[PDB]
Amino acid sequence: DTETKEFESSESVVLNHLNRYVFPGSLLMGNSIQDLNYKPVFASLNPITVSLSIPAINQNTAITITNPSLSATRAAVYNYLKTADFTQNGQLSYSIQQFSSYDELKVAFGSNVNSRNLFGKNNVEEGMVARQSGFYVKFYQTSFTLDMDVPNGSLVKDNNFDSEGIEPVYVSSISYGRMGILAIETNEKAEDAKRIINETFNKLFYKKQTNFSQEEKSFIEGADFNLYLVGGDGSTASQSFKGYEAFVNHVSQGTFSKDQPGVPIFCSYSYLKDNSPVKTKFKFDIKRPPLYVKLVKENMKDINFNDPDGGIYDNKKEAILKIYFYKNRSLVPTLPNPYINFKIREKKKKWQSIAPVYYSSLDQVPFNISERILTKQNTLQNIFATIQTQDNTEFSLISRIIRGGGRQNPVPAGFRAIEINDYELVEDSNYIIIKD
């Protein structure tokens, strides 16, 4: 049981192991950019004119690459920056979004990249956020950008090239600098997590401060972090840590220079055919995670109405039945999923006799048995739900035993009436029962 999700991207995050294919005019297979399995198309390329923008200082220029290539692009940029003003920290930006599956981070990367495998995932719970709440933070510093002009005709010189009948594409714009995508898992509630996360990032990443409150410090020390960073310091896979000082080192601004001016962090593509912009429509399915339910008795009351002078002892046991919902076996609370019908079995054991019957055990009583199933639905407002079994009360009778021999032989023995109700969850295809 999955959830299909569709998004469209005109821009892709450049993974650390692929930045060699990302430069202005880089000609690639039209079917190799969606899964980041870049396949260069070998062709003779014409000169290109690209606009170099340093948005942190609000400056722009125009460099020319006669023979498009990564080396010519590196040489062109440096030989401009070595004579011009540049930036140390670039243009900062971050965006905070909640997520439940690491497959949803595909959208943050703007491609059909195996995001869960990239973040160390890959039951379906393996690719699911474990703690109460999950948020990812896409933060980046843009040092400079390269944006091609529309070619005057074709970017290619000769149409004699092997693209395997696939209409090729070429890298038409690139943004350079440093980018991280930080997954955060907190047992805190989402409203509080989102606020604490925004507050701590405006402090460290933006303002470079570290005067966190104890609330924010406790959030950091108790949160699970998993970062994928694109940069000179970037790994090919994510990195899972759990530390404040580790949090402060990683979320901190990076530095740029004329010798290290930033790596390709995201890029856009055009078609070689008509020089039109490229946009991909993606579709991925999120396997719905399981629902765990536990039946519990609460507000339990054991009442004894005893008449030792008349040899009658009435013991009534009661409780409020309650089902609790969880997203995993670690009892992380969750709001129930819509349209699940929670089923509770009531097995009743009833017996009575006008005259005391001296059974040595309740396993000897000839009980009259009856069973029914209660059904609870539409409970999507709380991480638990009360199970009503009677009229005019949230309490359910667990036990009701009256015994005794009467005024004559006023012993606490014999049996006059027994009613015993046993309760359990009924197996369903939409939830897994947890019974202690």
Residue numbers in the entry: 77 to 198, 203 to 516
From the publication, what sentences describe this entry?
A recently found family of pore-forming toxins, called CDC-like proteins (CDCLs), are wide-spread in gut microbes and are a prevalent means of antibacterial antagonism. Analysis of the CDCLs belonging to the phylum Bacteroidota revealed the presence of sets of two-component CDCLs, one long CDCL (CDCLL) with four domains and one short CDCL (CDCLS) lacking the fourth C-terminal domain, that act as a bicomponent complex via a mechanism only previously observed in the mammalian complement MAC. Here, we present the crystal structure of a proteolytically activated CDCLL and cryo–electron microscopy (cryo-EM) structures of a prepore-like intermediate and the transmembrane pore.
We determined the crystal structure of act-EaCDCLL to 2.49-Å resolution, revealing the absence of electron density for the D2 β1 strand and its preceeding N-terminal extension, consistent with the MS results above that the peptide dissociates from the protein. We attribute this to altered crystal packing between the two structures and likely flexibility of the domain interface due to very limited interdomain contacts. One notable difference between the pro- and act-EaCDCLL crystal structures is the slight outward movement (1.2 Å) and shortening of the β5 strand (~15 to ~6.5 Å) in the core D3 β sheet in the activated structure. Movement of this strand in CDCs is critical for oligomerization and assembly of the prepore state. Previously, the C11-type protease family was identified as the proteases that activate CDCLs in vivo. This yields the act-EaCDCLL lacking the activation loop and preceding N terminus that also displays movement of the β5 strand away from the CDC-like β4 strand oligomerization interface. Thus, this experiment shows that the D4 of CDCLL is necessary for membrane binding and recruiting CDCLS to form the pore.
